[PDB]
Write a protein that binds this ligand. Structure first.
Ligand SMILES: *[C@@H]1O[C@H](CO)[C@@H](O)[C@H](O)[C@H]1NC(C)=O
Lengths: 221, 220, 221
């Protein structure tokens, strides 16, 4: 029962919303000495910060390695490297990370409300569904008109892997509940999806009251 | 480290299409290798369940104490207390379990496939929603025709506490990918929603595949 | 013959798409020179390798790169020059804009007089009422982003109100009639500094211009 080292990726919210990029390197498990020598093999000057004295169960002392400024080298195709050596673990070990290939673009649907509650006039559901993208990293946001709703007025599941033929694609869902007065009045809403395979980082679908046309023809003798 | 105590519940996956009766309360923290029944309260149907597990290490153990009597005391809110006294305990570790009610019922809707997804005719998508009640676990099976499918052609998420006003409620969804021409031949599909607020613990719903032209002729 | 100094805000196509965002100070003269930047930022600049303009004085530029987070953070930048023909050093400065406004985007359906000739249909995108005058416009078909050589966008003029100062811009895209009658969908995207998620999208297809009900009556009397 002892862990080995591996390397995470930058967060997609930070990488897409324009702010920054980090890169984390972790080992843990036992409350031992602060000779946790983290060393980064590529480093443009501003090297890492040996992070805060974090604790885990039965005093499992975790400290990490985090470096700022990792947008352009991660995005154009570098190959980063983290190595470490400990007082207890004086035998050094190394992990690698690489930005993935073999990408597919998502497909996003928004679906109208449920005739059963369309008659009830209490609350309506709008469900957003995305399907068929290559890494398991997405964003979902909802809007109304031009105003962004807060992140507490809906719920979203995690991205499961779908089982189908050959390759491994993913999917994720979310639902939104809104009262009926504005829905029958004519207010509109939107579902946005962020993913790193789209060329402009985002797509957006909107829905509103999809009905067919009426035709009345009458002959009077 | 820590010998612990934590609150558990009978796993309700075995009361709808299951015929057995166990309790679902494993070790609270730590013990040693034993024959999985430590003595509780009941002199009520002494038909005690058993089974010897192997030995475990790395801090904890893999040893429970399971005792029967599940669906027969399932009327009026009785407690069942997980007991285990193996010599790492500095006191007899009589745990406790409290069962609340206020069980609410699913509101299952279904809905057509998306409109612009049917200009390519590769596959067909249907989604099945199930929302709004106080307990946690729900099951689901998909069927084409009338007989229920195995667990190798659908996908189902977990259940989250939905953001609602006033109440404490949940939700769960699941999707289905079938072919185009089989949907085009008028085949029908249903999802079953099994919960313990339903009278018979099943629910179904299914639609399938419109102009509004009306002509009227009156005289004089 | 005459000396001059300038700065420039970073371009929006680099602030929004790929974050390597420059910041340019020019000097137009030398009819040899050193530049100084008051925020330190570690990484020094590069001088222009000094082309000429307007049949006269050969200008010289210098570009401080890697300033994408202090631009959005609200910081201030000044660059100070020096030259033999200058008595005093010249200085200038640049800040991010305050009191912004976000745009309103509309996508209009084609005129019905156009569908009777079976050649090409015309889509129109309009964005109106945004306070800093810089913007981007991109078109799509389904998910495929179209190349830039297939449409036409105008510049960003100033619109005549009395309240504040605001701006507007248009764009057209002409697609084929056979692809319009099949049910292909098309989209318009706008990027602005003052939008919260940096992009907004509107779409269209062969429905949604059709009327909701038709009443015909023929009277044989
Ligand atoms: C810097 O910019 C301000 C406006 O923000 C201007 O008033 C001033 O003249 C500039 N130059 C300085 C402080 O040298």
């Amino acid at each position: 029962c002892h862990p080995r080292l591996s390397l995470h990726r930058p967060a997609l919210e930070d990488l897409l919303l324009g702010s920054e990029a980090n890169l984390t390197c972790t080992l843990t498990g036992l409350r031992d000495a602060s000779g946790a020598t983290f060393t980064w093999t590529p480093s443009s000057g501003k090297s890492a910060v040996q992070g805060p004295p974090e604790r885990d169960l039965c005093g499992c002392y975790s400290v990490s390695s985090v470096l700022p400024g990792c947008a352009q080298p991660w995005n154009h195709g570098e190959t980063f490297t983290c190595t470490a050596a400990h007082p207890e673990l004086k035998t050094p070990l190394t992990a690698n990370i690489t930005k993935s290939g073999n990408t597919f673009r998502p497909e996003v649907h928004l679906l109208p409300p449920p005739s059963e509650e369309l008659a009830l006039n209490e609350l309506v559901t709008l469900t957003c569904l995305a399907r068929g993208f290559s890494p398991k990293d997405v964003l979902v946001r909802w809007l109304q008109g031009s105003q962004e709703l807060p992140r507490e007025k809906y719920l979203t599941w995690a991205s499961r892997q779908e089982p189908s033929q050959g390759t491994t694609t993913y999917a994720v869902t979310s639902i939104l509940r809104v009262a009926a007065e504005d829905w029958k009045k004519g207010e509109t809403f939107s579902c946005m999806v962020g993913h790193e395979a789209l060329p402009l980082a985002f797509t957006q679908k909107t829905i509103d009251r999809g009905k067919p046309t009426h035709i009345n023809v009458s002959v009077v003798m």
